[PDB]
Amino acid sequence: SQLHKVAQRANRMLNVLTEQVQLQKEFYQVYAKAALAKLPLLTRANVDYAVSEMEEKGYVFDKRPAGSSMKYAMSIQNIIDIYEHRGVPKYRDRYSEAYVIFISNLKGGVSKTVSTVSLAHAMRAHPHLLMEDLRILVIDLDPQSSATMFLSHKHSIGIVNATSAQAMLQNVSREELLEEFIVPSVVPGVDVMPASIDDAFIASDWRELCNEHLPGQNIHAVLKENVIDKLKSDYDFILVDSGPHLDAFLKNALASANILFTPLPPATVDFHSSLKYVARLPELVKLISDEGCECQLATNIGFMSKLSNKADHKYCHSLAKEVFGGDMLDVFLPRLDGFERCGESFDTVISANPATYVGSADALKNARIAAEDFAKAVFDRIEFIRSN
Amino acid sequence: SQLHKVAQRANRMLNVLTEQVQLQKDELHANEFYQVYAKAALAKLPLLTRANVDYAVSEMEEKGYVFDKRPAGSSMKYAMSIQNIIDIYEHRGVPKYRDRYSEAYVIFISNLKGGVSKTVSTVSLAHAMRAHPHLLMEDLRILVIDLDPQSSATMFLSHKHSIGIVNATSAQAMLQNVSREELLEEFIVPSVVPGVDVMPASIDDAFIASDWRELCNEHLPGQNIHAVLKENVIDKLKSDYDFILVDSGPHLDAFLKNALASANILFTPLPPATVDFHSSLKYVARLPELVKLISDEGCECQLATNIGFMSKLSNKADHKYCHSLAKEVFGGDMLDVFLPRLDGFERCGESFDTVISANPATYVGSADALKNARIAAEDFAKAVFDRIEFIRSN
Ligand SMILES: Nc1ncnc2c1ncn2[C@@H]1O[C@H](COP(=O)(O)OP(=O)(O)O)[C@@H](O)[C@H]1O
Ligand SMILES: Nc1ncnc2c1ncn2[C@@H]1O[C@H](COP(=O)(O)OP(=O)(O)O)[C@@H](O)[C@H]1O
Ligand SMILES: Nc1ncnc2c1ncn2[C@@H]1O[C@H](COP(=O)(O)OP(=O)(O)O)[C@@H](O)[C@H]1O
Ligand SMILES: Nc1ncnc2c1ncn2[C@@H]1O[C@H](COP(=O)(O)OP(=O)(O)O)[C@@H](O)[C@H]1O
Ligand SMILES: [Mg+2]
Ligand SMILES: [Mg+2]
């Protein structure tokens, strides 16, 4: 019974490791005052007018020493406050309930996680969307916790116990969710409900686990009802990311989504595997419905992901347009060195500090712009869907 | 309901692309594996000498055996393939592995924490043992059973256009319960290295894992749901392979339980980062419980032991520390060799090549890098082979 023998030493080392991590436990972006004029609706004159009026009222802007005289170091919140002061409404002023996005595809490694966390940070901080003052939550439902690691700071969560899966089973109050399950990401305004390796055991025993702690509740509606419905007034966008496993987490994510996006890989074979997922989607929803709840799933938008300037890639892109037609996004996510490098250190191209970036400055810049163009394209497609 | 319309079109496009893929398929040739040895280098191998190699070659040629030769400047020179070397050992009367072990030994490199190298380790172990310079006299027959719908093992083992669109998968074989002969002819496919075969996987298997219980009750009425891989596949191929390695995704589902119930031994790749190592130890502590659950609902696992090894290890300060903790946890069951993080592995990984199969004439990296990683795979495979020999012979 040596498995027990090694298992017991393992159990003891865990407590030793947990102590080592708990004994170890920021956005870089600021704007010069003059730089705000480049933003929509702002001018050098109206920014100075709003700034002086706010300071007269008592507001204090962030500043940082610039050699001799000290200068304004506008944070994203400072900019958002300036738009508010000037009477520009926020996104929540026209939509009164969180919209749920699920970037999904049974084929793994196609960028579900990177496009998810990039979309969240880039919508928040997009130059043209700051006036929208977006509140965004990313719910991680993959036990591998890739979204969690991208959104938090290494020595911030350390060992996570309160996970999205735990919240689903415990069925707590809006207040407890906000206070004990949700954690802020590196970019203020974007939050994450983390995941951990222990959730793999939760997924495995979902049936029985639901009978015990959630007697009578439909097994596919647990995330929507015990978590998302309680946070509907606290966020403008809620993005769910799960692993590629066709299990309870994936089904609960599907049942809670308002819209789906499918990242489409460009290599003929990966594209082929992705189409099988696209072809069986209606089958999965039917299955969910027939045995419980209905998905208020609007449409499924496709976008090429990790696209390169290669004959075969352009060819599959041609085929994707044919398959998705109108539901094809006009913007794609290019394969770029910036995404690759940031991916290595679990940074989003929006959160990576350019001063620390171990790579070409241009590569980081180009990737940020790609993420911004993709986020703007997604935001506008969603605006069209919700405005009609 | 445009969801149905997009699906319809996706389906039509699928059929189109299937045909286009099938037409591009290129049949694989066993005599194409790149590795060849100079006749003179054979004397460096175990049990061979300059004189007994010269005698063996001459005696074999006299019986009609023909060794390939290639122009090398001023003369044509022998280009010895691994099969030619295996045949020289046989000519000399050296027994093979199957002459002392008559049933396949099942290995499962497992860990619920993902990206720890379960796949690259499995695939590198399979190719590197078969083609290890010091294990050629064993003439090994190795099968890799891919049970991950993402099919990473399948991709590493085959050539892009050698396999085509996959339908006959490991998961399908488990449900169809076909004969030994049908498995050998319709499901098993050869990898780029002769002697190492693969039972492939495909994205469709994700639906099979999800509906497992209903599918078993329907296609396999009355059979224990944890005993399917062992009884419908592996037990039938026991005389056909020396080692059978199983690779599944990092999901606690039927494929992983079926692999556990089938293995003779387990290896746990242990990642070097504190938190990853931490997630791995949670898996190691829960193993007994996993095995116990399977025992309670059906079959008993015959898992000998669980050997741990450091994977993607770097000569770093923090890594050295976790390596110490791993020793304390696994103790005598820690392998002495580790798989280091190396650019060769990373580059080969991007093109789904094994560092054993990668042709140095095509490698888009430094020659030293590929060579270093090939040697690291060979050292790891020999250590694993030696450890299993000790267990099986004592
Ligand atoms: N556009 C891109 N360009 C370059 N690398 C990318 C891009 N999108 C994702 N990646 C990288 O590809 C891998 C797979 O992406 P990931 O988001 O984890 O996929 P899923 O979430 O599909 O498994 C990661 O290692 C990631 O850093
Ligand atoms: N924000 C995060 N939260 C949790 N885990 C993380 C985070 N960022 C990275 N990780 C995990 O920790 C590891 C850190 O890599 P490592 O090379 O040890 O880092 P450093 O060199 O930062 O110690 C990764 O392989 C990953 O599994
Ligand atoms: N020793 C290594 N050095 C460098 N890269 C490695 C090494 N082992 C694995 N990798 C790379 O790490 C990734 C994860 O390995 P993989 O075998 O797929 O893990 P699992 O099978 O753990 O999901 C792949 O991109 C792979 O090529
Ligand atoms: N042996 C294989 N069998 C099936 N799919 C493979 C195999 N080797 C690689 N692949 C898949 O095909 C892709 C090949 O990359 P890609 O950039 O399209 O290649 P090329 O540029 O070779 O067309 C990988 O991302 C992987 O998903
Ligand atoms: Mg992911
Ligand atoms: Mg794998």
Residues B145 and B245: beta-carbon distance below 8 Å: yes
Q: Is A308 helix (H, G, I), strand (E, B) or coil?
A: coil
Give rounded-to-5 percent helix, strand, coil for chain A.
50, 10, 35
How remote is the CA of residue A115 from the centroid of ligand 1, in Å?
A: 8
Residues A68 and A37: beta-carbon distance below 8 Å: no
B21 phi and psi, to 5 degrees? -75, -45
CATH architecture of B33-102: Orthogonal Bundle (1.10)
**Beta-carbon pairs below 8 A across chains A and B:** 160
> How many whole angstroms separate alpha carbon B183 and alpha carbon A91?
59
A270 close to ligand 4 (CB < 6 Angstrom): yes
B310 has which bridge partners?
Answer: B270
Residues A192 and A263: beta-carbon distance below 8 Å: no
A127 phi and psi, to 5 degrees? -45, -40
Experimental structure resolution, Å:
2.0
> How many whole angstroms separate alpha carbon B372 and alpha carbon B378?
10
> How many whole angstroms separate alpha carbon A243 and alpha carbon A143?
7
- The residue whose two tokens read 């490791």 is A17
> How many whole angstroms separate alpha carbon B354 and alpha carbon B344?
9
Ligand nearest to the CA of A347: 2
| CA triple B56-B62-B67, angle to 5 deg | 65
Give the closest-approach CA distance of B277 to chain A in angstroms.
Answer: 9
How remote is the CA of residue B347 from the centroid of ligand 4, in Å?
A: 14
Cβ contact, residue pair B285, A322, below 8 Å? no
Ligand nearest to the CA of A115: 1
- Chain A positions touching B296 (Cβ under 8 A) are none
B41 has which bridge partners?
Answer: none
Q: Which of A1, A5, A13 to mutate to test the interface with B (most CBs of B within 10 A)?
A: A13
Give the atom of ligand 4 at the shortest distance from the alpha carbon of A312.
Answer: 23
How remote is the CA of residue B113 from the centroid of ligand 5, in Å?
A: 13
Cβ contact, residue pair B17, A268, below 8 Å? yes
Query: Domain spans of chain A?
Result: 27-96, 97-388
B199 has which bridge partners?
Answer: B145
> How many whole angstroms separate alpha carbon A253 and alpha carbon A227?
11
DSSP A264: E
> How many whole angstroms separate alpha carbon A258 and alpha carbon A240?
11
> How many whole angstroms separate alpha carbon A209 and alpha carbon A186?
33
Ligand nearest to the CA of A339: 1
CATH architecture of B103-394: 3-Layer(aba) Sandwich (3.40)
- Whose Cα sits closest to atom 13 in ligand 1? A109
Residues B378 and B128: beta-carbon distance below 8 Å: yes
Cβ contact, residue pair A200, B112, below 8 Å? yes
Tell me the Cα Rg of chain B: 22
A225 close to ligand 4 (CB < 6 Angstrom): no
> How many whole angstroms separate alpha carbon A15 and alpha carbon B268?
20
Nearest to A341 by CA among A328, A354, A332: A354
- Whose Cα sits closest to atom 26 in ligand 1? A343
Residues A190 and A120: beta-carbon distance below 8 Å: yes
The secondary element (H helix, E strand) that includes residue A237 is strand A237-242
> How many whole angstroms separate alpha carbon A107 and alpha carbon A15?
36
Q: Which of A25, A107, A259, A275 to mutate to test the interface with B (most CBs of B within 10 A)?
A: A275
Q: Which long-range contacts (CB under 8 A, 24 or more apart) does A8-12 make?
A: A8/B285, A9/B328, A9/B329, A9/B330, A9/B331, A10/B281, A10/B282, A10/B284, A10/B285, A10/B329, A11/B285
Give the closest-approach CA distance of B11 to chain A in angstroms.
Answer: 6
Residues B257 and B108: beta-carbon distance below 8 Å: no
Give the dihedral sign, CA A245/A247/A249/A254: positive
Cβ contact, residue pair A325, B252, below 8 Å? no
Residues B54 and A309: beta-carbon distance below 8 Å: no
Q: In what order do the strands lie in the sheet with B196-199?
A: B189-190, B196-199, B142-147, B243-248, B105-109, B265-270, B306-313, B339-340
B27 phi and psi, to 5 degrees? -65, 135
Please state at what angle helix A2-21 crosses helix B274-296, rounded to 10 degrees.
150
> How many whole angstroms separate alpha carbon B312 and alpha carbon B339?
6
Q: Is A58 helix (H, G, I), strand (E, B) or coil?
A: coil
Report the 3 state secondary structure along A327-363.
HECCCCEECCHHHHHHHHCCCCCCCCCCCCCCCCHHH
Of residues A7, A282, A324, nearest to B284 (C-beta): A7
Q: Is A271 helix (H, G, I), strand (E, B) or coil?
A: helix
Cβ contact, residue pair B286, A3, below 8 Å? no
Q: CB within 8 A of A107, min separation 6: which ones?
A: A244, A265, A270, A273, A274, A277, B150, B203
β-pairing, A183-184 vs A237-242, is unpaired
Of residues B112, B206, B303, nearest to A106 (C-beta): B206
> How many whole angstroms separate alpha carbon A14 and alpha carbon B142?
36
- Chain B positions touching A278 (Cβ under 8 A) are 6-7, 10
- Chain A positions touching B210 (Cβ under 8 A) are 246-247
> How many whole angstroms separate alpha carbon A241 and alpha carbon A61?
36
Q: How far, in Å, are A98, A126, A303, B4 from residue A300 at the CA level?
A: 18, 24, 10, 11
The secondary element (H helix, E strand) that includes residue A47 is helix A44-57
DSSP A36: G
One-letter identity of residue B376: A
Q: Is A251 helix (H, G, I), strand (E, B) or coil?
A: helix
Experimental determination technique: X-ray
First-to-final CA distance of chain A: 65
> How many whole angstroms separate alpha carbon B152 and alpha carbon B352?
8
Q: How far, in Å, are A97, A134, B73, B250 from residue A229 at the CA level?
A: 9, 18, 77, 30
> How many whole angstroms separate alpha carbon B237 and alpha carbon B239?
6
β-pairing, B265-270 vs B105-109, is parallel
Cβ contact, residue pair B160, A269, below 8 Å? yes
**DSSP per position, A62-124:** -EEE-SSSEEE-B-HHHHHHHHHHTTPPPGGGT--SPEEEEE--SSTTSSHHHHHHHHHHHHH
Which residues approach ligand 2 with their CB closer than 6 A?
Answer: A 149, 152-154, 157, 346; B 273, 275-276, 318
Q: In what order do the strands lie in the sheet with A99-103?
A: A183-184, A190-193, A136-141, A237-242, A99-103, A259-264, A300-307, A333-334
- Return the exposure string of B208-224: e unless at least 16 CB atoms fall within 10 Å of the residue's CB, then b: bbbebeebbeeebeeee
Q: How far, in Å, are A14, A77, A191, A197, B334 from residue B329 at the CA level?
A: 10, 49, 36, 19, 8
Cβ contact, residue pair B14, A272, below 8 Å? yes
The secondary element (H helix, E strand) that includes residue A139 is strand A136-141
> How many whole angstroms separate alpha carbon B366 and alpha carbon B369?
5
Q: Is A218 helix (H, G, I), strand (E, B) or coil?
A: coil
Q: CB within 8 A of A371, min separation 6: which ones?
A: A118, A119, A121, A122, A333, A348, A349, A350
- Whose Cα sits closest to atom 15 in ligand 4? A267
> How many whole angstroms separate alpha carbon A218 and alpha carbon A225?
10
- Whose Cα sits closest to atom 3 in ligand 1? A335
CATH architecture of A97-388: 3-Layer(aba) Sandwich (3.40)
Ligand nearest to the CA of A304: 1
Give the atom of ligand 4 at the shortest distance from the alpha carbon of B163.
Answer: 3
Cβ contact, residue pair B279, A21, below 8 Å? no
- Chain A positions touching B249 (Cβ under 8 A) are 245
Q: How many CA atoms lie within 13 A of B250 on its CB side?
A: 25
- Whose Cα sits closest to atom 16 in ligand 1? A111
Residues A103 and A61: beta-carbon distance below 8 Å: no
Of residues B3, B6, B275, nearest to A323 (C-beta): B6
Q: Which of B4, B5, B6, B335 to mutate to test the interface with A (most CBs of A within 10 A)?
A: B6
Q: Which of B155, B281, B314, B328 to mutate to test the interface with A (most CBs of A within 10 A)?
A: B281
DSSP A32: -
Longest dimension (CA), chain A: 77
> How many whole angstroms separate alpha carbon A115 and alpha carbon A371?
8
- Chain B positions touching A18 (Cβ under 8 A) are 278
Which residues approach ligand 1 with their CB closer than 6 A?
Answer: A 108-114, 146, 306, 333, 335-336, 339-340, 343
What is the distance of C-alpha A295 from the center of its chain? 21
Report the 3 state secondary structure along chain B.
CHHHHHHHHHHHHHHHHHHHHHHHCCCCCHHHCCCCECHHHHHHCCCCCHHHHHHHHHHHHHCCCCCCEEECCCCEEECECHHHHHHHHHHCCCCCHHHHCCCCEEEEECCCCCCCCHHHHHHHHHHHHHCCCCCHHHCCCEEEEEECCCCHHHHHHCCHHHHCCCCCCHHHHHHHCCCHHHHHHHHCEECCCCCEEEECCCCCHHHHHHCHHHHHHHHCCCCCCCCHHHHHCHHHCCCCCCEEEEEECCCCCHHHHHHHHHCCEEEEEECCCHHHHHHHHHHHHHHHHHHHHHHHCCCCCCCCCEEEEEEEECCCHHHHHHHHHHHHHHHHHECCCCEECCHHHHHHHHCCCCCCCCCCCCCCCCHHHHHHHHHHHHHHHHHHHHHHHHHHHC
> How many whole angstroms separate alpha carbon B51 and alpha carbon A259?
74
Task: Determine how many CB atoms are found less than 10 A away from the CB of residue B20.
Answer: 13
> How many whole angstroms separate alpha carbon B70 and alpha carbon B60?
19
- Chain A positions touching B159 (Cβ under 8 A) are none
Which residues have their alpha-adjacent CB atom under 5 A from ion ligand 6? Answer: B 118-119, 152
CATH architecture of A27-96: Orthogonal Bundle (1.10)
The secondary element (H helix, E strand) that includes residue A301 is strand A300-307
Nearest to A146 by CA among A243, A280, A216, A254: A243
Q: Is A18 helix (H, G, I), strand (E, B) or coil?
A: helix
Torsion of CA A41, A47, A51, A57, to 10 degrees: -50
Residues B20 and B38: beta-carbon distance below 8 Å: no
How remote is the CA of residue B363 from the centroid of ligand 6, in Å?
A: 23
Tell me the Cα Rg of chain A: 22
Cβ contact, residue pair B150, A244, below 8 Å? yes
Please state at what angle helix A248-256 crosses helix A268-290, rounded to 10 degrees.
80
User: What are the tokens at B168?
Assistant: 């006959």
User: What are the tokens at B224?
Assistant: 């224990």
Cβ contact, residue pair B150, A109, below 8 Å? yes
β-pairing, B243-248 vs B105-109, is parallel
Cβ contact, residue pair A17, B278, below 8 Å? yes
Q: Is A243 helix (H, G, I), strand (E, B) or coil?
A: coil
